[PDB]
Structure formats: C-alpha cells, structure tokens
Amino acid sequence: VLATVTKPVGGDKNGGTRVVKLRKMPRYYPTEDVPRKLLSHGKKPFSQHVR
RNA sequence: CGGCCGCCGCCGGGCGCAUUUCCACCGCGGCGGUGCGCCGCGACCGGCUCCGGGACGGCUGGGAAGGCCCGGCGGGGAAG
Structure with missing residues (x-):
C-alpha cells in the first residue's frame, strides 16, 4: 500500500525478503x-452519438 | 563539538528472469501532445435568418355571414 x-x-529466492514494485x-x-488530460466533459465520442 | 535521527556517496556481503537494469519486437493497452498535403462525417453549445404544426384571451362578452325557418305589418327596384 x-x-x-x-x-x-516473489523474487529473492535466497538472501533476504521478497518485495516487488508496480507503477514505478x-x-x-x-x-x-x-x-490537464483533456476530458469527457459532455462531448460524447462517436460511439454514442444519436443515429 | 559529544550525542539524536534522517539523507547521500563509496566499500564489503548474501544474491537470480516474479528481485534489477539495459535492449529489440508485439500487445498498437492506460495517458499526453500531433498528422506530410488534400478532404469528408456525427453529436452537444452560442449567435442569427427562416419553415411547418398546433392550443388561447379580449371586442359591441366580437361585426358580418352559413343552416332549418315559421304566423304578421309595410316599403322599394322591376315578375314567363
């Protein structure tokens, strides 16, 4: 956490403890x-427009 | 400065592909900007310019028609 x-x-088969990372x-x-990753904002993508 | 704690560097250690770092290729996955040049498309929004349907209030509680007209008084244009 x-x-x-x-x-x-996982890792460290011998030696010390087994600690791994993610999203380094x-x-x-x-x-x-x-x-500012742009956003949805109410401008829907083409998948959801009204045919 | 003695001591406290933290940090960084150097060194020595166990150490193995689920530790780590580097690389080439698919995923072309999650995200950021963006195309070589010419185009097109859809939806939300602002600003206008128009089109078509409706439903309503007042008036002299609308005027005047339109319809079925019946029993009388007259008058006036011009009636096979």
Missing part, C-alpha cells in the same frame, strides 16, 4: 509538460 506500492511476494517512477521527465 505505502511502503511497497501493491504486493510483495518515471525514468525520464520532459523539459516542459502540458496540463
């Missing part, structure tokens, strides 16, 4: 990002 992200089991850090942050 917080120490890990999702669920530690970004490996590359672009030098300038744009905001």
Whole structure:
C-alpha cells in the first residue's frame, strides 16, 4: 500500500525478503509538460452519438 | 563539538528472469501532445435568418355571414 506500492511476494529466492514494485517512477521527465488530460466533459465520442 | 535521527556517496556481503537494469519486437493497452498535403462525417453549445404544426384571451362578452325557418305589418327596384 505505502511502503511497497501493491504486493510483495516473489523474487529473492535466497538472501533476504521478497518485495516487488508496480507503477514505478518515471525514468525520464520532459523539459516542459502540458496540463490537464483533456476530458469527457459532455462531448460524447462517436460511439454514442444519436443515429 | 559529544550525542539524536534522517539523507547521500563509496566499500564489503548474501544474491537470480516474479528481485534489477539495459535492449529489440508485439500487445498498437492506460495517458499526453500531433498528422506530410488534400478532404469528408456525427453529436452537444452560442449567435442569427427562416419553415411547418398546433392550443388561447379580449371586442359591441366580437361585426358580418352559413343552416332549418315559421304566423304578421309595410316599403322599394322591376315578375314567363
């Protein structure tokens, strides 16, 4: 949940404990990002228009 | 500075493909922008310009017709 992200089991057949990650850090942050993933907002896609 | 805790770097360790990092290819999955050039389409919204159907209130509680007209008084145009 917080120490890990999702669920530690697996890996480390010998050695220590078995902890795995999911949805890790970004490996590359672009030098300038744009905001606000656009949205639905009431402008429905073509699948749902009225024939 | 002694001590407290955290962080970072270096080193030494167990260590194995479900740990990790790197790569090439499919998923062309979730998301961000975007096409090479020419186009088209649908729906929501704003702004107009029009078209077609309705239903209603008043008036002199509308005027005047339209319909079935019957028993009388007259008058006036012009009646096979």
